[model samples]
Target chain A: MGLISPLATMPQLYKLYVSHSEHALGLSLTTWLLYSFIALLWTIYGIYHKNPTIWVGNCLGFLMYVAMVVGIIAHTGGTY
Target chain B: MGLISPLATMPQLYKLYVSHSEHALGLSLTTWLLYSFIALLWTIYGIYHKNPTIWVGNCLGFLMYVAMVVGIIAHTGGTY
Candidate 1:
Protein backbone atom coordinates (compact mmCIF):
# COMPACT_ATOMS: atom_id res chain seq x y z
CA MET A 1 0.00 0.00 0.00
CA GLY A 2 2.65 2.50 1.01
CA LEU A 3 4.86 1.38 -1.81
CA ILE A 4 2.23 2.91 -4.04
CA SER A 5 4.66 5.76 -4.19
CA PRO A 6 6.06 4.16 -7.32
CA LEU A 7 2.93 5.02 -9.30
CA ALA A 8 2.39 8.39 -7.64
CA THR A 9 5.19 10.26 -9.37
CA MET A 10 6.34 7.90 -12.08
CA PRO A 11 3.68 8.51 -14.69
CA GLN A 12 3.92 12.27 -14.34
CA LEU A 13 7.67 12.18 -14.75
CA TYR A 14 7.42 9.63 -17.53
CA LYS A 15 4.92 11.79 -19.38
CA LEU A 16 7.12 14.79 -18.90
CA TYR A 17 10.03 12.81 -20.22
CA VAL A 18 8.08 11.59 -23.23
CA SER A 19 6.74 15.03 -23.98
CA HIS A 20 8.77 18.00 -22.86
CA SER A 21 6.57 20.74 -24.19
CA GLU A 22 4.64 22.99 -21.86
CA HIS A 23 1.62 23.09 -24.17
CA ALA A 24 0.61 19.43 -24.02
CA LEU A 25 1.41 18.74 -20.41
CA GLY A 26 -0.56 20.11 -17.45
CA LEU A 27 1.89 19.44 -14.65
CA SER A 28 2.47 22.47 -12.47
CA LEU A 29 5.94 22.79 -11.00
CA THR A 30 4.65 24.84 -8.09
CA THR A 31 2.01 22.25 -7.29
CA TRP A 32 4.54 19.44 -7.27
CA LEU A 33 6.90 21.52 -5.16
CA LEU A 34 4.08 22.01 -2.69
CA TYR A 35 3.63 18.24 -2.52
CA SER A 36 7.33 17.75 -2.00
CA PHE A 37 7.35 20.25 0.84
CA ILE A 38 4.29 18.70 2.45
CA ALA A 39 5.90 15.29 2.32
CA LEU A 40 8.90 16.72 4.09
CA LEU A 41 6.68 18.15 6.79
CA TRP A 42 4.96 14.80 7.26
CA THR A 43 8.27 13.03 7.46
CA ILE A 44 9.30 15.43 10.20
CA TYR A 45 6.02 15.01 11.96
CA GLY A 46 6.42 11.28 11.85
CA ILE A 47 9.83 11.59 13.39
CA TYR A 48 8.52 13.85 16.11
CA HIS A 49 5.87 11.31 17.00
CA LYS A 50 8.30 8.41 16.90
CA ASN A 51 6.08 6.57 14.46
CA PRO A 52 8.16 4.40 12.21
CA THR A 53 5.36 3.78 9.76
CA ILE A 54 4.64 7.45 9.35
CA TRP A 55 8.26 8.46 9.11
CA VAL A 56 9.25 5.73 6.72
CA GLY A 57 6.23 6.18 4.52
CA ASN A 58 6.59 9.94 4.34
CA CYS A 59 10.36 9.76 3.92
CA LEU A 60 9.91 7.74 0.75
CA GLY A 61 7.14 10.06 -0.34
CA PHE A 62 9.44 13.05 0.16
CA LEU A 63 12.10 11.53 -2.03
CA MET A 64 9.59 10.70 -4.77
CA TYR A 65 8.09 14.20 -4.73
CA VAL A 66 11.53 15.80 -4.91
CA ALA A 67 12.56 13.52 -7.72
CA MET A 68 9.46 14.47 -9.66
CA VAL A 69 10.26 18.10 -9.00
CA VAL A 70 13.76 17.68 -10.34
CA GLY A 71 12.49 15.70 -13.29
CA ILE A 72 9.81 18.30 -14.01
CA ILE A 73 12.32 21.11 -13.76
CA ALA A 74 14.83 19.32 -15.90
CA HIS A 75 12.28 18.50 -18.54
CA THR A 76 10.91 22.06 -18.42
CA GLY A 77 14.12 23.62 -19.78
CA GLY A 78 16.04 24.14 -16.54
CA THR A 79 13.77 26.80 -15.05
CA TYR A 80 12.98 27.03 -11.33
CA MET B 1 1.36 23.43 6.39
CA GLY B 2 -1.13 20.76 5.41
CA LEU B 3 -3.13 23.52 3.75
CA ILE B 4 -0.42 23.37 1.17
CA SER B 5 -2.69 20.76 -0.43
CA PRO B 6 -4.47 23.69 -2.06
CA LEU B 7 -1.41 24.12 -4.18
CA ALA B 8 -0.82 20.41 -4.65
CA THR B 9 -3.75 19.57 -6.94
CA MET B 10 -5.10 23.01 -7.83
CA PRO B 11 -2.30 24.02 -10.13
CA GLN B 12 -2.37 20.76 -12.02
CA LEU B 13 -6.10 21.04 -12.62
CA TYR B 14 -5.80 24.70 -13.51
CA LYS B 15 -3.03 23.95 -15.96
CA LEU B 16 -5.11 21.21 -17.52
CA TYR B 17 -7.92 23.69 -17.94
CA VAL B 18 -5.67 26.14 -19.73
CA SER B 19 -3.58 23.79 -21.83
CA HIS B 20 -6.03 20.92 -22.50
CA SER B 21 -3.34 18.94 -24.23
CA GLU B 22 -1.33 15.85 -23.41
CA HIS B 23 1.94 17.37 -24.60
CA ALA B 24 2.39 20.14 -22.04
CA LEU B 25 0.74 18.46 -19.07
CA GLY B 26 2.50 15.67 -17.18
CA LEU B 27 -0.07 15.11 -14.49
CA SER B 28 -0.71 11.36 -14.54
CA LEU B 29 -4.14 9.97 -13.72
CA THR B 30 -2.77 6.69 -12.31
CA THR B 31 -0.23 8.50 -10.17
CA TRP B 32 -2.87 10.73 -8.69
CA LEU B 33 -5.13 7.76 -8.16
CA LEU B 34 -2.43 6.12 -6.14
CA TYR B 35 -2.06 9.27 -4.07
CA SER B 36 -5.78 9.39 -3.45
CA PHE B 37 -5.82 5.82 -2.27
CA ILE B 38 -2.85 6.32 -0.02
CA ALA B 39 -4.48 9.32 1.54
CA LEU B 40 -7.59 7.29 2.19
CA LEU B 41 -5.52 4.60 3.86
CA TRP B 42 -3.77 7.17 5.97
CA THR B 43 -7.06 8.73 6.94
CA ILE B 44 -8.27 5.36 8.11
CA TYR B 45 -5.06 4.66 9.92
CA GLY B 46 -5.26 8.01 11.62
CA ILE B 47 -8.68 7.09 12.90
CA TYR B 48 -7.52 3.71 14.05
CA HIS B 49 -4.60 5.25 15.87
CA LYS B 50 -6.63 8.08 17.26
CA ASN B 51 -4.45 10.68 15.59
CA PRO B 52 -6.43 13.70 14.51
CA THR B 53 -3.45 15.37 12.93
CA ILE B 54 -2.91 12.42 10.69
CA TRP B 55 -6.58 11.87 9.85
CA VAL B 56 -7.48 15.50 9.28
CA GLY B 57 -4.41 16.16 7.23
CA ASN B 58 -4.96 13.07 5.12
CA CYS B 59 -8.70 13.60 4.76
CA LEU B 60 -8.01 16.93 3.14
CA GLY B 61 -5.31 15.33 1.10
CA PHE B 62 -7.68 12.62 -0.10
CA LEU B 63 -10.12 15.21 -1.35
CA MET B 64 -7.44 17.10 -3.24
CA TYR B 65 -6.07 13.98 -4.83
CA VAL B 66 -9.51 12.80 -5.93
CA ALA B 67 -10.30 16.26 -7.25
CA MET B 68 -7.22 16.15 -9.41
CA VAL B 69 -8.15 12.70 -10.67
CA VAL B 70 -11.59 13.88 -11.70
CA GLY B 71 -10.15 16.95 -13.32
CA ILE B 72 -7.63 14.93 -15.22
CA ILE B 73 -10.19 12.45 -16.43
CA ALA B 74 -12.58 15.21 -17.34
CA HIS B 75 -10.00 17.11 -19.37
CA THR B 76 -8.52 14.05 -21.04
CA GLY B 77 -11.29 12.96 -23.38
CA GLY B 78 -13.53 11.30 -20.78
CA THR B 79 -11.53 8.12 -20.55
CA TYR B 80 -10.97 6.38 -17.23
Candidate 2:
Protein backbone atom coordinates (compact mmCIF):
# COMPACT_ATOMS: atom_id res chain seq x y z
CA MET A 1 0.00 0.00 0.00
CA GLY A 2 2.86 2.33 0.76
CA LEU A 3 4.34 1.90 -2.68
CA ILE A 4 1.00 2.37 -4.36
CA SER A 5 0.02 5.27 -2.15
CA PRO A 6 1.68 7.84 -4.34
CA LEU A 7 -0.43 6.63 -7.17
CA ALA A 8 -3.34 7.89 -5.09
CA THR A 9 -3.03 11.12 -6.99
CA MET A 10 -3.05 9.27 -10.29
CA PRO A 11 -6.76 8.64 -10.65
CA GLN A 12 -7.67 12.29 -10.93
CA LEU A 13 -4.90 12.94 -13.37
CA TYR A 14 -6.95 11.16 -15.97
CA LYS A 15 -10.15 13.06 -15.30
CA LEU A 16 -8.24 16.28 -15.10
CA TYR A 17 -6.59 15.77 -18.45
CA VAL A 18 -8.43 13.03 -20.25
CA SER A 19 -12.05 13.41 -19.30
CA HIS A 20 -14.06 14.34 -22.33
CA SER A 21 -16.36 16.41 -20.17
CA GLU A 22 -17.00 19.92 -21.36
CA HIS A 23 -15.80 21.38 -18.07
CA ALA A 24 -14.05 20.55 -14.84
CA LEU A 25 -17.46 19.51 -13.45
CA GLY A 26 -17.48 19.29 -9.66
CA LEU A 27 -13.77 19.95 -9.36
CA SER A 28 -12.82 23.02 -7.40
CA LEU A 29 -9.83 25.08 -8.44
CA THR A 30 -9.53 26.60 -5.00
CA THR A 31 -9.55 23.21 -3.33
CA TRP A 32 -6.94 21.85 -5.72
CA LEU A 33 -4.79 24.91 -5.10
CA LEU A 34 -5.11 24.40 -1.39
CA TYR A 35 -4.04 20.81 -1.88
CA SER A 36 -1.07 22.19 -3.77
CA PHE A 37 -0.11 24.22 -0.73
CA ILE A 38 -0.59 21.31 1.64
CA ALA A 39 1.51 19.05 -0.56
CA LEU A 40 4.28 21.64 -0.68
CA LEU A 41 4.20 21.91 3.07
CA TRP A 42 4.48 18.17 3.43
CA THR A 43 7.27 18.17 0.91
CA ILE A 44 9.11 20.78 2.91
CA TYR A 45 8.43 18.89 6.10
CA GLY A 46 9.93 15.80 4.48
CA ILE A 47 13.02 17.77 3.49
CA TYR A 48 13.45 19.20 6.96
CA HIS A 49 13.07 15.77 8.47
CA LYS A 50 15.76 14.44 6.10
CA ASN A 51 13.31 11.93 4.72
CA PRO A 52 13.63 11.54 0.98
CA THR A 53 10.76 9.12 0.79
CA ILE A 54 8.40 11.58 2.41
CA TRP A 55 9.61 14.51 0.37
CA VAL A 56 9.65 12.55 -2.86
CA GLY A 57 6.14 11.24 -2.34
CA ASN A 58 4.82 14.62 -1.40
CA CYS A 59 6.62 16.17 -4.34
CA LEU A 60 4.70 13.95 -6.69
CA GLY A 61 1.48 14.90 -4.93
CA PHE A 62 2.32 18.55 -5.33
CA LEU A 63 2.91 18.19 -9.04
CA MET A 64 -0.29 16.24 -9.57
CA TYR A 65 -2.32 18.79 -7.62
CA VAL A 66 -0.83 21.65 -9.61
CA ALA A 67 -1.75 19.85 -12.78
CA MET A 68 -5.30 19.50 -11.56
CA VAL A 69 -5.41 23.14 -10.69
CA VAL A 70 -4.32 24.05 -14.18
CA GLY A 71 -6.71 21.64 -15.78
CA ILE A 72 -9.59 22.73 -13.59
CA ILE A 73 -8.95 26.36 -14.35
CA ALA A 74 -8.79 25.62 -18.03
CA HIS A 75 -12.09 23.80 -17.94
CA THR A 76 -13.78 26.19 -15.54
CA GLY A 77 -13.25 29.11 -17.88
CA GLY A 78 -10.76 30.88 -15.58
CA THR A 79 -13.22 32.06 -12.96
CA TYR A 80 -10.95 31.30 -10.04
CA MET B 1 -1.64 29.30 8.99
CA GLY B 2 -1.57 25.96 10.74
CA LEU B 3 -5.00 26.58 12.21
CA ILE B 4 -6.34 27.54 8.82
CA SER B 5 -4.53 24.82 6.97
CA PRO B 6 -7.21 22.26 7.70
CA LEU B 7 -9.46 24.50 5.73
CA ALA B 8 -7.63 23.38 2.64
CA THR B 9 -10.51 20.95 2.25
CA MET B 10 -13.17 23.56 2.73
CA PRO B 11 -13.19 25.37 -0.58
CA GLN B 12 -14.42 22.52 -2.72
CA LEU B 13 -17.06 21.83 -0.16
CA TYR B 14 -19.07 24.72 -1.41
CA LYS B 15 -19.07 23.43 -4.92
CA LEU B 16 -20.09 20.09 -3.61
CA TYR B 17 -23.08 21.35 -1.71
CA VAL B 18 -24.04 24.94 -2.41
CA SER B 19 -22.99 25.64 -5.97
CA HIS B 20 -26.38 24.72 -7.38
CA SER B 21 -24.48 23.17 -10.21
CA GLU B 22 -26.40 20.65 -12.23
CA HIS B 23 -23.78 18.00 -11.69
CA ALA B 24 -20.38 17.16 -10.25
CA LEU B 25 -18.79 18.51 -13.40
CA GLY B 26 -15.11 17.64 -13.61
CA LEU B 27 -14.83 16.27 -10.13
CA SER B 28 -13.33 12.80 -9.90
CA LEU B 29 -15.05 10.46 -7.48
CA THR B 30 -12.15 8.02 -7.50
CA THR B 31 -9.79 10.83 -6.61
CA TRP B 32 -11.92 11.90 -3.68
CA LEU B 33 -12.12 8.32 -2.49
CA LEU B 34 -8.33 8.08 -2.60
CA TYR B 35 -8.14 11.27 -0.59
CA SER B 36 -10.40 9.61 1.92
CA PHE B 37 -7.84 6.83 2.20
CA ILE B 38 -4.94 9.24 2.61
CA ALA B 39 -6.71 11.26 5.23
CA LEU B 40 -7.71 8.16 7.12
CA LEU B 41 -4.11 6.95 7.04
CA TRP B 42 -2.86 10.23 8.40
CA THR B 43 -5.46 10.01 11.09
CA ILE B 44 -4.23 6.57 11.99
CA TYR B 45 -0.66 7.69 11.79
CA GLY B 46 -1.49 10.46 14.18
CA ILE B 47 -2.89 7.92 16.57
CA TYR B 48 0.14 5.70 16.19
CA HIS B 49 2.52 8.59 16.79
CA LYS B 50 0.47 9.89 19.70
CA ASN B 51 0.06 13.16 17.85
CA PRO B 52 -3.36 14.61 18.58
CA THR B 53 -2.77 17.60 16.37
CA ILE B 54 -2.13 15.48 13.33
CA TRP B 55 -5.05 13.18 13.95
CA VAL B 56 -7.53 15.93 14.69
CA GLY B 57 -6.52 17.87 11.63
CA ASN B 58 -6.53 14.85 9.41
CA CYS B 59 -9.84 13.87 10.92
CA LEU B 60 -11.34 17.05 9.66
CA GLY B 61 -9.84 16.32 6.30
CA PHE B 62 -11.36 12.88 6.37
CA LEU B 63 -14.81 14.18 7.13
CA MET B 64 -14.60 16.79 4.42
CA TYR B 65 -13.42 14.27 1.89
CA VAL B 66 -16.18 11.89 2.73
CA ALA B 67 -18.66 14.66 2.36
CA MET B 68 -17.22 15.50 -1.02
CA VAL B 69 -17.36 11.89 -2.04
CA VAL B 70 -21.00 11.71 -1.10
CA GLY B 71 -21.78 14.99 -2.77
CA ILE B 72 -19.87 14.06 -5.88
CA ILE B 73 -21.69 10.79 -6.12
CA ALA B 74 -24.98 12.51 -5.68
CA HIS B 75 -24.19 15.11 -8.29
CA THR B 76 -22.69 12.66 -10.70
CA GLY B 77 -25.90 10.63 -10.55
CA GLY B 78 -24.54 7.72 -8.52
CA THR B 79 -22.62 6.18 -11.33
CA TYR B 80 -20.02 4.68 -9.10
Candidate 3:
Protein backbone atom coordinates (compact mmCIF):
# COMPACT_ATOMS: atom_id res chain seq x y z
CA MET A 1 0.00 0.00 0.00
CA GLY A 2 2.79 2.38 0.85
CA LEU A 3 4.55 1.75 -2.44
CA ILE A 4 1.45 1.57 -4.58
CA SER A 5 -0.22 4.79 -3.45
CA PRO A 6 2.49 7.28 -4.42
CA LEU A 7 3.12 5.49 -7.69
CA ALA A 8 -0.51 6.03 -8.65
CA THR A 9 0.35 9.60 -9.56
CA MET A 10 2.83 8.41 -12.15
CA PRO A 11 0.29 8.32 -14.97
CA GLN A 12 -0.73 11.88 -14.28
CA LEU A 13 2.92 12.91 -14.42
CA TYR A 14 3.39 10.92 -17.60
CA LYS A 15 0.54 12.75 -19.27
CA LEU A 16 1.78 16.11 -18.08
CA TYR A 17 5.26 15.37 -19.44
CA VAL A 18 4.04 14.01 -22.73
CA SER A 19 1.43 16.64 -23.43
CA HIS A 20 3.55 19.62 -22.47
CA SER A 21 0.37 21.15 -21.19
CA GLU A 22 0.68 22.12 -17.58
CA HIS A 23 -2.44 24.20 -17.31
CA ALA A 24 -4.38 21.58 -19.15
CA LEU A 25 -3.44 19.02 -16.54
CA GLY A 26 -6.13 20.57 -14.34
CA LEU A 27 -4.22 20.03 -11.08
CA SER A 28 -3.78 22.50 -8.27
CA LEU A 29 -0.13 23.52 -8.32
CA THR A 30 -0.35 25.20 -4.95
CA THR A 31 -1.81 22.09 -3.38
CA TRP A 32 0.91 19.89 -4.77
CA LEU A 33 3.61 22.25 -3.56
CA LEU A 34 2.02 22.39 -0.15
CA TYR A 35 1.62 18.62 -0.12
CA SER A 36 5.33 18.20 -0.72
CA PHE A 37 6.00 20.13 2.44
CA ILE A 38 3.50 18.01 4.35
CA ALA A 39 5.06 14.86 2.97
CA LEU A 40 8.44 15.96 4.26
CA LEU A 41 6.96 16.55 7.68
CA TRP A 42 5.37 13.10 7.66
CA THR A 43 8.68 11.60 6.64
CA ILE A 44 10.32 13.15 9.65
CA TYR A 45 7.50 12.05 11.91
CA GLY A 46 7.78 8.53 10.54
CA ILE A 47 11.46 8.50 11.35
CA TYR A 48 10.83 9.71 14.86
CA HIS A 49 8.18 7.06 15.42
CA LYS A 50 10.29 4.29 13.91
CA ASN A 51 7.59 3.52 11.38
CA PRO A 52 9.20 2.33 8.18
CA THR A 53 5.94 2.32 6.25
CA ILE A 54 5.27 5.95 6.97
CA TRP A 55 8.85 6.89 6.33
CA VAL A 56 9.13 5.07 3.01
CA GLY A 57 5.66 6.06 1.86
CA ASN A 58 6.05 9.75 2.50
CA CYS A 59 9.62 9.78 1.19
CA LEU A 60 8.40 8.46 -2.15
CA GLY A 61 5.38 10.75 -2.08
CA PHE A 62 7.58 13.77 -1.52
CA LEU A 63 9.72 12.79 -4.49
CA MET A 64 6.69 12.45 -6.72
CA TYR A 65 5.33 15.83 -5.64
CA VAL A 66 8.70 17.46 -6.27
CA ALA A 67 8.69 16.05 -9.78
CA MET A 68 5.15 17.29 -10.32
CA VAL A 69 6.09 20.75 -9.05
CA VAL A 70 9.04 20.91 -11.42
CA GLY A 71 7.00 19.68 -14.34
CA ILE A 72 4.16 22.10 -13.67
CA ILE A 73 6.50 25.02 -13.19
CA ALA A 74 8.46 24.19 -16.31
CA HIS A 75 5.41 23.78 -18.47
CA THR A 76 3.40 26.64 -17.03
CA GLY A 77 6.35 28.99 -16.69
CA GLY A 78 5.46 29.26 -12.98
CA THR A 79 2.27 31.09 -13.67
CA TYR A 80 0.35 29.07 -11.11
CA MET B 1 3.97 17.00 12.90
CA GLY B 2 0.90 14.84 12.37
CA LEU B 3 -1.41 17.67 13.21
CA ILE B 4 0.52 20.39 11.48
CA SER B 5 1.21 18.56 8.24
CA PRO B 6 -2.32 17.94 6.99
CA LEU B 7 -3.53 21.35 8.02
CA ALA B 8 -1.12 22.84 5.50
CA THR B 9 -3.75 22.25 2.85
CA MET B 10 -6.31 24.36 4.66
CA PRO B 11 -5.20 27.62 3.07
CA GLN B 12 -5.52 26.13 -0.37
CA LEU B 13 -9.00 24.94 0.44
CA TYR B 14 -9.88 28.34 1.80
CA LYS B 15 -8.75 29.97 -1.42
CA LEU B 16 -10.62 27.50 -3.52
CA TYR B 17 -13.77 28.05 -1.52
CA VAL B 18 -13.47 31.82 -1.36
CA SER B 19 -12.58 32.34 -4.98
CA HIS B 20 -15.02 29.74 -6.27
CA SER B 21 -12.36 29.16 -8.88
CA GLU B 22 -11.58 25.52 -9.46
CA HIS B 23 -9.57 25.81 -12.64
CA ALA B 24 -7.89 28.87 -11.29
CA LEU B 25 -6.79 26.87 -8.26
CA GLY B 26 -4.59 24.88 -10.69
CA LEU B 27 -4.27 21.64 -8.70
CA SER B 28 -4.16 18.17 -10.09
CA LEU B 29 -7.42 16.56 -9.08
CA THR B 30 -6.13 13.13 -10.07
CA THR B 31 -3.19 13.33 -7.70
CA TRP B 32 -5.36 14.42 -4.83
CA LEU B 33 -7.86 11.68 -5.42
CA LEU B 34 -5.02 9.19 -5.47
CA TYR B 35 -3.67 10.70 -2.29
CA SER B 36 -6.99 10.20 -0.51
CA PHE B 37 -6.79 6.52 -1.29
CA ILE B 38 -3.25 6.41 0.01
CA ALA B 39 -4.28 8.22 3.15
CA LEU B 40 -7.03 5.69 3.73
CA LEU B 41 -4.52 2.89 3.40
CA TRP B 42 -2.20 4.61 5.83
CA THR B 43 -5.05 5.07 8.27
CA ILE B 44 -5.69 1.37 8.18
CA TYR B 45 -2.01 0.62 8.44
CA GLY B 46 -1.79 2.82 11.48
CA ILE B 47 -4.67 0.99 13.09
CA TYR B 48 -3.02 -2.34 12.48
CA HIS B 49 0.23 -1.09 13.93
CA LYS B 50 -1.42 0.70 16.87
CA ASN B 51 0.22 3.95 15.86
CA PRO B 52 -1.86 6.87 16.97
CA THR B 53 0.05 9.45 15.00
CA ILE B 54 -0.34 7.78 11.64
CA TRP B 55 -3.94 6.83 12.22
CA VAL B 56 -5.06 10.23 13.41
CA GLY B 57 -2.98 12.14 10.91
CA ASN B 58 -4.16 10.22 7.87
CA CYS B 59 -7.74 10.09 9.03
CA LEU B 60 -7.78 13.85 9.16
CA GLY B 61 -5.82 14.10 5.96
CA PHE B 62 -8.32 11.86 4.20
CA LEU B 63 -11.15 14.12 5.26
CA MET B 64 -9.27 17.15 4.01
CA TYR B 65 -8.64 15.51 0.67
CA VAL B 66 -12.28 14.59 0.42
CA ALA B 67 -13.25 18.18 1.04
CA MET B 68 -10.76 19.34 -1.54
CA VAL B 69 -12.15 16.85 -3.98
CA VAL B 70 -15.63 18.12 -3.36
CA GLY B 71 -14.59 21.74 -3.67
CA ILE B 72 -12.72 21.13 -6.89
CA ILE B 73 -15.55 19.15 -8.36
CA ALA B 74 -18.08 21.75 -7.36
CA HIS B 75 -16.02 24.57 -8.82
CA THR B 76 -14.91 22.77 -11.95
CA GLY B 77 -18.29 21.20 -12.66
CA GLY B 78 -16.53 17.84 -13.04
CA THR B 79 -14.63 18.86 -16.14
CA TYR B 80 -11.33 17.99 -14.54
Which digits, one per residue and each the tens of the lDDT, describe model 3 over residues B1-80? 56765665556556545544544334466666666676676667667867655676766766776776666566766533
TM-score of decoy 3: 0.61
Model 2, which residues run further than 4 Å from truth? Answer: A6-11, A18-33, B6-11, B18-32, B77-80
- Where does candidate 1 clash, by residue pair? A23-B24, A24-B22, A24-B23, A24-B24, A24-B25, A25-B23, A25-B24, A25-B25, A26-B24, A26-B25
What TM-score does model 1 score on chain A?
0.56
Q: Model 2 over residues A1-80: C-alpha lDDT tens digits?
A: 44566565555566545653334445565565565677677667667867656565665666665666666567655532
Which candidate model has the greater TM-score, 1 or 2? 2
Candidate 1 local lDDT, B1-80, one digit each (tens):
77657655655656655555434334566666566667777677667767656665666666655665566565564322
lDDT of 1 by residue, A1-80 (tens): 77657655655555655655444344566666566666677667667767766566665666665665566565554332
- Residue B35, candidate 2: alpha-carbon lDDT: 58
Model 2 pairs whose backbones collide: A24-B26, A25-B25, A25-B26, A26-B24, A26-B25, A26-B26, A26-B27
What does the lDDT read for residue A37 in candidate 3?
A: 66
Sorted on DockQ, best first, the list reads 1, 2, 3
How many collisions per candidate? 10, 7, 7
DockQ of candidate 1 is 0.57
